[PDB]
Write an enzyme that holds these catalytic residues in place. Structure first.
Site, PDB file in Angstrom:
ATOM      1  N   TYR B  15     -67.929-154.632   6.503  1.00 20.18           N
ATOM      2  CA  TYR B  15     -67.448-154.643   5.123  1.00 20.18           C
ATOM      3  C   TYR B  15     -66.117-153.895   5.020  1.00 20.18           C
ATOM      4  O   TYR B  15     -65.151-154.405   4.464  1.00 20.18           O
ATOM      5  CB  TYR B  15     -68.480-153.996   4.193  1.00 20.18           C
ATOM      6  CG  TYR B  15     -67.958-153.731   2.799  1.00 20.18           C
ATOM      7  CD1 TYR B  15     -68.062-154.695   1.791  1.00 20.18           C
ATOM      8  CD2 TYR B  15     -67.353-152.513   2.487  1.00 20.18           C
ATOM      9  CE1 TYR B  15     -67.576-154.446   0.501  1.00 20.18           C
ATOM     10  CE2 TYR B  15     -66.861-152.255   1.205  1.00 20.18           C
ATOM     11  CZ  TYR B  15     -66.977-153.221   0.220  1.00 20.18           C
ATOM     12  OH  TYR B  15     -66.498-152.950  -1.041  1.00 20.18           O
ATOM     13  N   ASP B  39     -68.909-150.021  -9.390  1.00 22.27           N
ATOM     14  CA  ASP B  39     -67.780-149.378  -8.728  1.00 22.27           C
ATOM     15  C   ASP B  39     -66.674-149.029  -9.726  1.00 22.27           C
ATOM     16  O   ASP B  39     -65.937-149.906 -10.180  1.00 22.27           O
ATOM     17  CB  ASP B  39     -67.254-150.343  -7.658  1.00 22.27           C
ATOM     18  CG  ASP B  39     -66.118-149.768  -6.842  1.00 22.27           C
ATOM     19  OD1 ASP B  39     -65.455-148.824  -7.308  1.00 22.27           O
ATOM     20  OD2 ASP B  39     -65.884-150.280  -5.728  1.00 22.27           O
TER      21      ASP B  39
END
Lengths: 124, 123
Positions: B15, B39
């Site tokens: 990732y 986030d």
């Protein structure tokens, strides 16, 4: 979730210091009455002060611990921090890499503690 | 929660690499079609690959790398510390972050939570 990001960083840095000195009573005081501990995360939650105190007694009752990076705090009373624990396993000195995620309450006490780590994070 | 601890480490390491190179579509495919992203954590979750794709396109000119090993669980979960180098006002800045992920039985990210605040920012 009352503590500010900066207060979270302070509370979590403090937690590491207490673990490092081995003050179980002081560590336990940081938790709230309904606090839960999942360490390692994936394992059943530990609740109840007597239980949480017993948890730290079997773990800390020559262990050393230090931050290996800055505390990452949010604005909703939560934080995450990376650290390394020095202990003994199989009768030999080892190191364990961990990341603690905590949710603090409106009183500045730990509501939830989740420690991520597994055998892969262990080094003898 | 199918990925093993070792696999989790591999998935989360990959990732960071995708974010480092900026392959938005490949990042999106790593997520479950109905995954959730918070986030920074404390902010409202975004739902699904369409919303997540738009989120990542808005964000990704950016450098990212692990600053510590990935901490994996035995139930398809993990957490990792990393840093992101970006540009703000033509000025280079850095952001320290810790991501927590839960993968599904298909090795796809079901939930992701990024912990950080402006106090982890350094311009």
């Amino acid at each position: 979730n009352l503590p500010t990001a900066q207060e979270v960083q302070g509370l979590m840095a403090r937690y590491i210091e207490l673990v490092d000195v081995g003050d179980i009573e002081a560590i336990v005081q940081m938790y709230a009455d309904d606090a839960t501990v999942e360490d390692p995360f994936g394992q059943p939650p530990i609740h109840g002060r007597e239980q949480i105190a017993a948890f730290y007694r079997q773990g800390l009752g020559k262990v050393r611990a230090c931050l290996t990076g800055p505390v990452r705090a949010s604005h909703n009373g939560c934080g995450a921090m990376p650290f390394r624990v020095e202990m003994v396993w199989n009768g030999q000195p080892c190191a364990l890499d961990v990341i603690l995620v905590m949710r603090f309450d409106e009183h500045g006490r730990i509501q939830t503690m989740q420690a991520y780590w597994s055998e892969v994070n262990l080094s003898v």
